[PDB]
Amino acid sequence: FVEDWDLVQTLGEGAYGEVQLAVNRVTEEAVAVKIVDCPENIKKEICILKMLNHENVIKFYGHRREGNIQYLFMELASGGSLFDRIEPDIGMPEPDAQRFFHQLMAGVVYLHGIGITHRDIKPHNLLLDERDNLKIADYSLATVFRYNNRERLLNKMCGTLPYVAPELLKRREFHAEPVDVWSCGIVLTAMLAGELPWDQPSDSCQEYSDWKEKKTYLNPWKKIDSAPLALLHKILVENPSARITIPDIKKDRWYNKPLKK
Ligand SMILES: Nc1ncnc2c1ncn2[C@@H]1O[C@H](COP(=O)(O)OP(=O)(O)NP(=O)(O)O)[C@@H](O)[C@H]1O
C-alpha cells in the first residue's frame, strides 16, 4: 500500500488529513500514518518531528512523499485519547488524573528542554498507548522558541480558545513556556471536573471574571478537591510572569501526594 506498509484502517480524521493504521508486510509492526495532501508547514512540522525522542511524545519514524501526498509514519497510540477518559461533568478519579498530569508534565519538560513549544495542548492531542501511557501528539502548530540558547518571543495567535492563555489574546509578544503551562492547567481542570471553565480567558467572559474574583463555590471549581485546586490557583494566573513554572509545579503538594497503587 505504501512501500512495504499496508494501510488497514482509519484511526481518525484531521483538519487536512486522515490517520491510518499501517502494518509492515515483512515485520508485522503496526504504526500510524498521517496522510496529507501550506506545504512549507509540513516541512517545518517534519523537521520538529525528527527531533522528538521521549516516552511521553509520539515518536516519528519517517516520511515518504508520493505525488502530492506526504505520508508521516509515527508511533501508534492504540488506547485512544485522553478526551475519551474524561466523563462529562465528572472527570475521572483523582489518582488517574494525577498520573496523567505527571506524564503530561514529563513530556512538556522534554519539549521545552529542546526548545520546542507545542501550542495546542488539549485532551484530543494527548493520546494513550496500550498501557495508558500519555503521548503528546499533533505537532502541526509546534514551533521553536529557543535556538542556540537564545529565547525568541512568540507573536502568532494559535491554539484552541478554551485552552489558550490570556496573554495570547492581550499581548503583542509573549513567552512560549507559560502558554503551554496554562493549557496544562485547563487540561487538569477537565480531568478533575469533566468540564471546561470558560470559552476563553478574556474579561468579556463572565466565567473567567468569576475565577479572577475567586468565586470557587461555582462550577467547575466546587467539584475539585482543595489540594489540586490550590495547584490550579498557581497555574491559572493571569500575569504570565507570576504564573507557576514547571520546576515549581513539581514541588506542589498535590503533585507529590500519594494517591495511586
Ligand atoms: N499516532 C497516533 N496513533 C493513533 N491515533 C492517532 C495518532 N495520531 C493521530 N491519531 C488520531 O487521528 C486523529 C487526527 O489526527 P491529527 O491530524 O494529528 O489530529 P487533528 O485532529 O487533525 N489536529 P490537526 O492535524 O492540527 O488538524 C487524532 O485526533 C487521533 O485520534
From Swiss-Prot:
Phosphorylated by ATR in a RAD17-dependent manner in response to ultraviolet irradiation and inhibition of DNA replication. Phosphorylated by ATM in response to ionizing irradiation. Its main location: nucleus. It is found in: Nucleus; Chromosome; Cytoplasm; Cytoplasm, Cytoskeleton, Microtubule organizing center, Centrosome. Residues 1-255 are annotated as: Interaction with CLSPN. GO terms for molecular function: ATP binding; histone H3T11 kinase activity; protein domain specific binding; protein kinase activity; protein serine kinase activity; protein serine/threonine kinase activity. Interacts (phosphorylated by ATR) with RAD51. Interacts with and phosphorylates CLSPN, an adapter protein that regulates the ATR-dependent phosphorylation of CHEK1. Interacts with BRCA1. Interacts with and phosphorylates CDC25A, CDC25B and CDC25C. Interacts with FBXO6, which regulates CHEK1. Interacts with PPM1D, which regulates CHEK1 through dephosphorylation. Interacts with TIMELESS; DNA damage-dependent. Interacts with FEM1B; activates CHEK1 in response to stress. Interacts with TLK1. Interacts with XPO1 and YWHAZ. Interacts with CDK5RAP3; antagonizes CHEK1. This is Serine/threonine-protein kinase Chk1. The chain holds residues 5 to 271 of 476 of the full protein.
